[PDB]
Design an enzyme around this catalytic site. Sequence first.
Site, PDB file in Angstrom:
ATOM      1  N   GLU A 156      43.176 -49.180   1.279  1.00  0.00           N
ATOM      2  CA  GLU A 156      44.377 -48.373   1.435  1.00  0.00           C
ATOM      3  C   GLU A 156      45.617 -49.244   1.275  1.00  0.00           C
ATOM      4  N   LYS A 215      70.033 -37.306  19.604  1.00  0.00           N
ATOM      5  CA  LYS A 215      69.921 -38.225  18.482  1.00  0.00           C
ATOM      6  C   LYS A 215      68.474 -38.551  18.155  1.00  0.00           C
ATOM      7  N   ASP A 216      67.590 -38.549  19.159  1.00  0.00           N
ATOM      8  CA  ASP A 216      66.158 -38.635  18.902  1.00  0.00           C
ATOM      9  C   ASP A 216      65.642 -37.400  18.188  1.00  0.00           C
ATOM     10  N   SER A 261      67.266 -52.631  26.131  1.00  0.00           N
ATOM     11  CA  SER A 261      67.319 -52.871  24.700  1.00  0.00           C
ATOM     12  C   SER A 261      68.445 -53.830  24.344  1.00  0.00           C
ATOM     13  N   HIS A 300      61.606 -51.828  30.519  1.00  0.00           N
ATOM     14  CA  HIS A 300      62.451 -51.259  31.556  1.00  0.00           C
ATOM     15  C   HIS A 300      63.139 -52.317  32.404  1.00  0.00           C
TER      16      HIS A 300
HETATM   17  C1  HEM Z   1      52.134 -47.640  19.169  1.00  0.00           C
HETATM   18  C2  HEM Z   1      52.989 -48.660  19.029  1.00  0.00           C
HETATM   19  C3  HEM Z   1      54.417 -48.819  19.623  1.00  0.00           C
HETATM   20  C4  HEM Z   1      55.188 -47.999  20.363  1.00  0.00           C
HETATM   21  C5  HEM Z   1      54.934 -46.574  20.896  1.00  0.00           C
HETATM   22  C6  HEM Z   1      56.427 -48.679  20.629  1.00  0.00           C
HETATM   23  C7  HEM Z   1      57.471 -48.157  21.354  1.00  0.00           C
HETATM   24  C8  HEM Z   1      58.683 -48.766  21.565  1.00  0.00           C
HETATM   25  C9  HEM Z   1      59.858 -48.155  22.132  1.00  0.00           C
HETATM   26  C10 HEM Z   1      59.984 -46.699  22.610  1.00  0.00           C
HETATM   27  C11 HEM Z   1      60.829 -49.055  22.170  1.00  0.00           C
HETATM   28  C12 HEM Z   1      62.238 -48.742  22.730  1.00  0.00           C
HETATM   29  C13 HEM Z   1      63.400 -49.079  21.805  1.00  0.00           C
HETATM   30  C14 HEM Z   1      63.274 -48.281  20.548  1.00  0.00           C
HETATM   31  O1  HEM Z   1      63.008 -47.062  20.657  1.00  0.00           O
HETATM   32  O2  HEM Z   1      63.428 -48.860  19.446  1.00  0.00           O
HETATM   33  C15 HEM Z   1      60.293 -50.293  21.625  1.00  0.00           C
HETATM   34  C16 HEM Z   1      60.931 -51.499  21.479  1.00  0.00           C
HETATM   35  C17 HEM Z   1      60.378 -52.665  21.022  1.00  0.00           C
HETATM   36  N1  HEM Z   1      59.146 -52.815  20.424  1.00  0.00           N
HETATM   37 FE1  HEM Z   1      57.730 -51.336  20.248  1.00  0.00          FE
HETATM   38  N2  HEM Z   1      56.387 -49.919  20.042  1.00  0.00           N
HETATM   39  C18 HEM Z   1      55.169 -50.037  19.415  1.00  0.00           C
HETATM   40  C19 HEM Z   1      54.739 -51.136  18.707  1.00  0.00           C
HETATM   41  C20 HEM Z   1      55.385 -52.344  18.624  1.00  0.00           C
HETATM   42  C21 HEM Z   1      55.028 -53.451  17.771  1.00  0.00           C
HETATM   43  C22 HEM Z   1      53.833 -53.363  16.799  1.00  0.00           C
HETATM   44  C23 HEM Z   1      55.917 -54.443  17.980  1.00  0.00           C
HETATM   45  C24 HEM Z   1      56.061 -55.870  17.390  1.00  0.00           C
HETATM   46  C25 HEM Z   1      55.113 -56.596  16.797  1.00  0.00           C
HETATM   47  C26 HEM Z   1      56.835 -53.983  18.993  1.00  0.00           C
HETATM   48  C27 HEM Z   1      57.889 -54.697  19.508  1.00  0.00           C
HETATM   49  C28 HEM Z   1      58.989 -54.148  20.117  1.00  0.00           C
HETATM   50  C29 HEM Z   1      60.175 -54.848  20.546  1.00  0.00           C
HETATM   51  C30 HEM Z   1      60.435 -56.359  20.405  1.00  0.00           C
HETATM   52  C31 HEM Z   1      61.004 -53.953  21.086  1.00  0.00           C
HETATM   53  C32 HEM Z   1      62.396 -54.206  21.688  1.00  0.00           C
HETATM   54  C33 HEM Z   1      63.437 -54.009  20.605  1.00  0.00           C
HETATM   55  C34 HEM Z   1      64.812 -54.036  21.198  1.00  0.00           C
HETATM   56  O3  HEM Z   1      64.956 -53.653  22.380  1.00  0.00           O
HETATM   57  O4  HEM Z   1      65.759 -54.446  20.489  1.00  0.00           O
HETATM   58  N3  HEM Z   1      56.491 -52.701  19.354  1.00  0.00           N
HETATM   59  N4  HEM Z   1      58.980 -50.074  21.264  1.00  0.00           N
HETATM   60  C1  LIG Z   2      65.169 -46.948  25.999  1.00  0.00           C
HETATM   61  O1  LIG Z   2      63.786 -47.052  25.816  1.00  0.00           O
HETATM   62  C2  LIG Z   2      62.984 -45.876  25.859  1.00  0.00           C
HETATM   63  C3  LIG Z   2      62.995 -44.952  24.815  1.00  0.00           C
HETATM   64  O2  LIG Z   2      63.813 -45.110  23.694  1.00  0.00           O
HETATM   65  C4  LIG Z   2      62.181 -43.839  24.873  1.00  0.00           C
HETATM   66  C5  LIG Z   2      62.247 -42.850  23.715  1.00  0.00           C
HETATM   67  C6  LIG Z   2      61.333 -43.607  25.944  1.00  0.00           C
HETATM   68  C7  LIG Z   2      60.445 -42.313  25.925  1.00  0.00           C
HETATM   69  C8  LIG Z   2      58.918 -42.573  26.101  1.00  0.00           C
HETATM   70  C9  LIG Z   2      58.001 -42.516  25.112  1.00  0.00           C
HETATM   71  C10 LIG Z   2      58.408 -42.203  23.657  1.00  0.00           C
HETATM   72  C11 LIG Z   2      56.507 -42.804  25.471  1.00  0.00           C
HETATM   73  C12 LIG Z   2      55.508 -41.955  24.648  1.00  0.00           C
HETATM   74  C13 LIG Z   2      54.244 -41.617  25.544  1.00  0.00           C
HETATM   75  C14 LIG Z   2      52.968 -41.839  25.135  1.00  0.00           C
HETATM   76  C15 LIG Z   2      52.691 -42.436  23.754  1.00  0.00           C
HETATM   77  C16 LIG Z   2      51.768 -41.466  26.101  1.00  0.00           C
HETATM   78  C17 LIG Z   2      50.393 -41.603  25.402  1.00  0.00           C
HETATM   79  C18 LIG Z   2      49.858 -40.216  24.893  1.00  0.00           C
HETATM   80  C19 LIG Z   2      48.629 -39.768  25.229  1.00  0.00           C
HETATM   81  C20 LIG Z   2      47.723 -40.594  26.129  1.00  0.00           C
HETATM   82  C21 LIG Z   2      48.114 -38.398  24.711  1.00  0.00           C
HETATM   83  C22 LIG Z   2      47.482 -37.610  25.893  1.00  0.00           C
HETATM   84  C23 LIG Z   2      46.157 -36.891  25.482  1.00  0.00           C
HETATM   85  C24 LIG Z   2      46.126 -35.575  25.240  1.00  0.00           C
HETATM   86  C25 LIG Z   2      47.402 -34.737  25.349  1.00  0.00           C
HETATM   87  C26 LIG Z   2      44.787 -34.892  24.843  1.00  0.00           C
HETATM   88  C27 LIG Z   2      45.066 -33.628  24.002  1.00  0.00           C
HETATM   89  C28 LIG Z   2      43.759 -32.853  23.718  1.00  0.00           C
HETATM   90  C29 LIG Z   2      43.668 -31.540  23.955  1.00  0.00           C
HETATM   91  C30 LIG Z   2      44.866 -30.770  24.525  1.00  0.00           C
HETATM   92  C31 LIG Z   2      42.337 -30.798  23.655  1.00  0.00           C
HETATM   93  C32 LIG Z   2      42.187 -29.579  24.566  1.00  0.00           C
HETATM   94  C33 LIG Z   2      40.838 -28.876  24.307  1.00  0.00           C
HETATM   95  C34 LIG Z   2      40.688 -27.572  24.513  1.00  0.00           C
HETATM   96  C35 LIG Z   2      39.336 -26.913  24.252  1.00  0.00           C
HETATM   97  C36 LIG Z   2      41.847 -26.703  25.008  1.00  0.00           C
HETATM   98  C37 LIG Z   2      61.319 -44.531  26.989  1.00  0.00           C
HETATM   99  O3  LIG Z   2      60.494 -44.363  28.112  1.00  0.00           O
HETATM  100  C38 LIG Z   2      62.137 -45.657  26.936  1.00  0.00           C
HETATM  101  O4  LIG Z   2      62.097 -46.588  28.004  1.00  0.00           O
HETATM  102  C39 LIG Z   2      63.088 -46.424  28.987  1.00  0.00           C
HETATM  103  C1  LIG Z   3      37.901 -54.307   1.639  1.00  0.00           C
HETATM  104  C2  LIG Z   3      38.127 -52.830   1.625  1.00  0.00           C
HETATM  105  C3  LIG Z   3      37.791 -52.096   0.506  1.00  0.00           C
HETATM  106  C4  LIG Z   3      37.981 -50.741   0.465  1.00  0.00           C
HETATM  107  C5  LIG Z   3      38.509 -50.084   1.557  1.00  0.00           C
HETATM  108  C6  LIG Z   3      38.855 -50.804   2.689  1.00  0.00           C
HETATM  109  N1  LIG Z   3      39.399 -50.119   3.823  1.00  0.00           N
HETATM  110  N2  LIG Z   3      38.823 -50.217   5.054  1.00  0.00           N
HETATM  111  N3  LIG Z   3      39.509 -49.480   5.888  1.00  0.00           N
HETATM  112  N4  LIG Z   3      40.508 -48.883   5.221  1.00  0.00           N
HETATM  113  C7  LIG Z   3      41.442 -47.984   5.877  1.00  0.00           C
HETATM  114  C8  LIG Z   3      40.443 -49.252   3.914  1.00  0.00           C
HETATM  115  O1  LIG Z   3      41.169 -48.902   3.014  1.00  0.00           O
HETATM  116  C9  LIG Z   3      38.669 -52.182   2.733  1.00  0.00           C
HETATM  117  C10 LIG Z   3      39.030 -53.007   3.934  1.00  0.00           C
HETATM  118  O2  LIG Z   3      40.181 -53.832   3.604  1.00  0.00           O
HETATM  119  C11 LIG Z   3      40.635 -54.681   4.550  1.00  0.00           C
HETATM  120  C12 LIG Z   3      41.565 -55.687   4.417  1.00  0.00           C
HETATM  121  N5  LIG Z   3      41.760 -56.299   5.569  1.00  0.00           N
HETATM  122  N6  LIG Z   3      40.930 -55.680   6.455  1.00  0.00           N
HETATM  123  C13 LIG Z   3      40.786 -56.006   7.824  1.00  0.00           C
HETATM  124  C14 LIG Z   3      41.665 -56.875   8.444  1.00  0.00           C
HETATM  125  C15 LIG Z   3      41.493 -57.157   9.785  1.00  0.00           C
HETATM  126  C16 LIG Z   3      40.453 -56.569  10.473  1.00  0.00           C
HETATM  127 CL1  LIG Z   3      40.229 -56.918  12.167  1.00  0.00          CL
HETATM  128  C17 LIG Z   3      39.584 -55.699   9.862  1.00  0.00           C
HETATM  129  C18 LIG Z   3      39.750 -55.417   8.525  1.00  0.00           C
HETATM  130  C19 LIG Z   3      40.236 -54.694   5.866  1.00  0.00           C
END
Ligand code: HEM
Ligand SMILES: COc1c(O)c(C)c(C/C=C(\C)CC/C=C(\C)CC/C=C(\C)CC/C=C(\C)CC/C=C(\C)CCC=C(C)C)c(O)c1OC
Ligand SMILES: Cc1cccc(-n2nnn(C)c2=O)c1COc1cnn(-c2ccc(Cl)cc2)c1
Lengths: 75, 385, 93, 50, 99, 54
Positions: free
Chosen positions: B272, B228-229, B206, B202
């Site tokens: 996997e 678009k999303d 981007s 923020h």
């Molecule tokens: C659960 C994992 C992740 C989430 C939810 C996430 C989410 C996001 C979002 C929403 C953006 C905004 C721009 C876009 O939508 O493309 C973004 C940008 C970015 N993410 Fe992630 N990301 C994740 C993992 C990662 C990982 C694994 C990397 C790199 C190793 C990474 C690096 C970046 C970078 C560098 C940007 C900026 C790109 C740009 O602005 O050109 N993120 N991410």
């Molecule tokens: C330009 O850059 C961007 C941008 O592109 C986008 C898309 C966003 C939009 C934001 C996102 C996509 C963020 C996504 C949010 C998360 C990943 C939050 C994490 C989610 C959780 C912690 C999940 C919460 C947990 C639950 C809901 C538990 C559910 C369990 C239930 C309901 C069981 C209930 C049980 C009974 C018995 C009823 C931006 O904020 C942003 O920056 C400006």
């Molecule tokens: C060997 C084997 C044989 C058969 C099934 C599995 N395996 N274990 N988990 N999953 C999802 C899976 O396929 C695996 C594990 O394979 C691997 C490969 N790299 N890693 C790995 C890398 C980094 C960390 Cl911190 C932990 C684990 C684990």
Amino acid sequence: EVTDQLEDLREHFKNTEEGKALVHHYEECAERVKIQQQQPGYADLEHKEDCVEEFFHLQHYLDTATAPRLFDKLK
Amino acid sequence: MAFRKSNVYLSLVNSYIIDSPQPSSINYWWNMGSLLGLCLVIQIVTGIFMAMHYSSNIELAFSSVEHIMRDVHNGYILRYLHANGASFFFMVMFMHMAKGLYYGSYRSPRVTLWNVGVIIFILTIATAFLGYCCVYGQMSHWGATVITNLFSAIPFVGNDIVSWLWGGFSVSNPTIQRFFALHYLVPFIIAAMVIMHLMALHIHGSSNPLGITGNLDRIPMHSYFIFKDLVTVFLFMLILALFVFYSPNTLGHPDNYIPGNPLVTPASIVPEWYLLPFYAILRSIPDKLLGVITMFAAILVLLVLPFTDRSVVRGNTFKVLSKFFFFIFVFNFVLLGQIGACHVEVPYVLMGQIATFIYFAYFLIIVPVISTIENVLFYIGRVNK
Amino acid sequence: GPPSGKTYMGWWGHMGGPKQKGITSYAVSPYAQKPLQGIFHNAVFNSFRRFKSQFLYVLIPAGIYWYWWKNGNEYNEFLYSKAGREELERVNV
Amino acid sequence: MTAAEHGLHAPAYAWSHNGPFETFDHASIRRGYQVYREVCAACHSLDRVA
Amino acid sequence: EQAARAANQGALPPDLSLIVKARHGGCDYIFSLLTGYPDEPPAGVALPPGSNYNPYFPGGSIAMARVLFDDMVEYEDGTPATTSQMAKDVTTFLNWCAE
Amino acid sequence: SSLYKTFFKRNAVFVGTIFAGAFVFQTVFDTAITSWYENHNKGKLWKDVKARIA
Ligand code: HEM
Ligand SMILES: COc1c(O)c(C)c(C/C=C(\C)CC/C=C(\C)CC/C=C(\C)CC/C=C(\C)CC/C=C(\C)CCC=C(C)C)c(O)c1OC
Ligand SMILES: Cc1cccc(-n2nnn(C)c2=O)c1COc1cnn(-c2ccc(Cl)cc2)c1
Ligand SMILES: CCCCCCCCCCC(=O)OC[C@H](COP(=O)(O)OC[C@H](O)COP(=O)(O)OC[C@@H](COC(=O)CC)OC(=O)CCC)OC(=O)CCCCCCCC
Ligand SMILES: CCCCCCCCCCCCCCCCCC(=O)OC[C@H](COP(=O)(O)OCCN)OC(=O)CCCCCCCCCCCCC
Ligand code: HEM
Ligand code: HEM
Ligand SMILES: CCCCCCCCCCCCCCCCCC(=O)O[C@H](COC(=O)CCCCCC)COP(=O)(O)OCCN
């Protein structure tokens, strides 16, 4: 009164010369290993000839030819 | 002002997904980050509803997954959406990291945004390993045996970490009970790292495929990028539904439908598909301590990338030699996954060794040499002399 | 709270670019333009034009890695046949 | 490994439940329990079926 | 389990509740396993005492003999119970037991 | 044209019709899909086998 259908098709596709090219190739292998295993002395050996490779080549053709053709004959 | 800008809670929603300034030339590669937020929600929700029926004891764990499949009302939908959702979660994250490696998103001022992303990638690998050992199939037992035996090679402290990871003398009942409790927890650490990830975004915003400043043409987030999303969300849920309802065991292994046995080993142990490129880096090193260092160094070499890029333009849109060597690195990563699914035979021990050399030489040799060559080629092709 | 360190982006009104002077822009509402005009002259040609530019940076690295896999595969099937039984020895150890 | 150590490859027959719109044949499930009870149950169990 | 290996010369016949989903091939492997015993082994192989040859088993030698022959059951609907007919119906039933 | 408060003008008819149709569509789409599935697979269901063992 009615024999089983898979061994009926397994001989009808042995009645093509595509099959006889692979039947004769495996029968040649069997008559080379059997003037062997009666020659004087084995457990001398560390490796000798089988006919498993020539077996699978004949089995592979028979399954390409009978697999799309069988389940319309069964109930 | 409006109520959505004066409230303490509604202003955070308004400043992030409503009135956020966006560069108007970004393409569909910038949609992968929102789609990863939907992937984390599906994995947490379907896993909580499955945890109501699961037992973590080593003599009840395999049969309780069968109870969810056969007895629980719509229980097969919950498991199939959970096991196939983890592969879709890893596919979008490989496309998310490759975009920022292409368009230069790691450079200043977005270095902190790239460093928090590397931490999320390590926690997502650890999460998928812990949950795969909770089914307790025949692949679950021998995958956890091979990995936990790697930590017995650490010098002067090796027979402690492994006896503290096991809770005993082998992979047994204390190992499965503690792996499920850690599996509940790390998805909540990942969600807190995602909040810190969006804070660093923020303050700078981007980039764009042109790679230049975007403060001259901006449109808001609402009513232009929400629709678009929405396009890639409905494409995501339709291809995911084709796997859950029509081919639910294609991204799996049939040896996980055998209950695990410490006295019978399987004829082929294969992970996997998303751990196969990193499994092949491990088997290439003949030492045991040097092998476990190299497999963890394959993820920490992403942090040297802001320092070895010596270019003065950001991205890969106008760079001819840097566009060629980007796809050498991509298909070398698909060759590494295919080696890691094969047997250890002798055309393949040398193919997997040279391909591990191309992995590390791209970051430390190929990038700083090709970067400075294009700086000199842009100069003498312009300066009249 | 207090103001923090300065960035390279602002908000609406002070986004932080150079000053502009002498550029004009025009547009027409979506309710006045015909529905789905840019569906032809779009992917049947445009994306057929954009593919033809950027394909040779993909297909030459792909062809080297598929020649290496197919040629390395057929040498493994030769070594585990009857004709390749002696060359399995003197190679593996 | 050799093809003798991997096993032969099973071909692709045309089962009536292959396809995205197909159902099991419940007259071939009924006759299949008759072959389990008479030939198969002498040495194999079916412990997951109520 | 000790009483199962005692009646099968050390070998353990597995449980058939999930055998379709736990094998490479699925319905095609269980059908081709039963209707695939040769009348004689190929020339050159040497089997252990108390073994059978089946080329769909990895290694070639299996501890299960051929158990399906012609007209060994009598169906109620009147279907002719041949070798391939009865082998088709166990694999349709056993796939339902898994799914 | 001159049907808009009969169709989608009102805030409480923009969401007060797409919530109204959300149950009428819910039961007639469910019935017609189930009717098509059990004629494409006619002769294999348990309803057809039980009438053959009469
Ligand atoms: C659960 C994992 C992740 C989430 C939810 C996430 C989410 C996001 C979002 C929403 C953006 C905004 C721009 C876009 O939508 O493309 C973004 C940008 C970015 N993410 Fe992630 N990301 C994740 C993992 C990662 C990982 C694994 C990397 C790199 C190793 C990474 C690096 C970046 C970078 C560098 C940007 C900026 C790109 C740009 O602005 O050109 N993120 N991410
Ligand atoms: C330009 O850059 C961007 C941008 O592109 C986008 C898309 C966003 C939009 C934001 C996102 C996509 C963020 C996504 C949010 C998360 C990943 C939050 C994490 C989610 C959780 C912690 C999940 C919460 C947990 C639950 C809901 C538990 C559910 C369990 C239930 C309901 C069981 C209930 C049980 C009974 C018995 C009823 C931006 O904020 C942003 O920056 C400006
Ligand atoms: C060997 C084997 C044989 C058969 C099934 C599995 N395996 N274990 N988990 N999953 C999802 C899976 O396929 C695996 C594990 O394979 C691997 C490969 N790299 N890693 C790995 C890398 C980094 C960390 Cl911190 C932990 C684990 C684990
Ligand atoms: C498994 C996960 C499922 C969900 C994944 C979502 C999709 C991920 C794919 C990655 C990606 O987004 O790459 C897009 C890339 C560049 O995109 P672009 O902005 O330059 O082109 C916009 C154009 O003007 C249409 O834009 P338009 O305005 O027409 O949008 C409508 C379009 C939307 O559909 C999509 O594009 C979804 C991808 O639908 C139509 O075309 C209507 C047809 C009647 O296009 C390409 O360069 C093609 C490369 C192929 C990518 C394959 C990836 C390998 C795995
Ligand atoms: C440590 C782990 C890190 C992960 C390592 C990488 C894992 C590989 C994951 C595979 C997915 C990555 C492929 C796509 C990478 C992103 C490419 C991209 O960002 O777009 C670049 C390009 C955009 O085109 P341009 O913007 O240059 O058009 C000219 C405008 N003036 O758009 C393109 O050129 C797209 C062309 C088609 C790309 C897909 C080809 C097939 C890729 C192999 C996939 C194999 C899967 C088995
Ligand atoms: C980022 C989030 C998550 C990922 C990547 C993930 C990954 C996995 C994977 C790959 C499996 C193996 C499934 C299989 O192969 O059949 C699994 C199993 C399981 N996971 Fe998750 N998981 C996540 C979140 C959660 C959470 C928060 C819970 C909370 C209870 C949970 C509960 C379970 C359970 C109960 C199993 C039992 C075995 C099964 O259902 O197959 N998961 N997890
Ligand atoms: C009539 C239906 C039968 C079916 C469908 C059937 C099916 C199978 C299957 C699928 C296997 C496992 C193959 C593998 O492990 O890859 C197997 C193994 C075995 N079956 Fe049967 N079987 C039947 C009858 C019998 C009978 C009557 C016996 C009597 C002794 C028997 C004894 C065995 C044994 C000993 C094994 C173990 C083979 C080994 O592990 O080497 N089976 N059977
Ligand atoms: C990891 C933590 C994540 C951080 C959370 C950030 C996102 C949270 C916002 C998500 C939407 C929640 C907004 C609730 C709707 C607006 C509430 C409101 O009108 O403010 C309050 C209502 O009072 C409440 O009872 C709040 C209940 C909170 C319920 C929490 C579930 C009205 O406050 P007020 O009238 O003073 O508005 C200021 C006008 N200048």
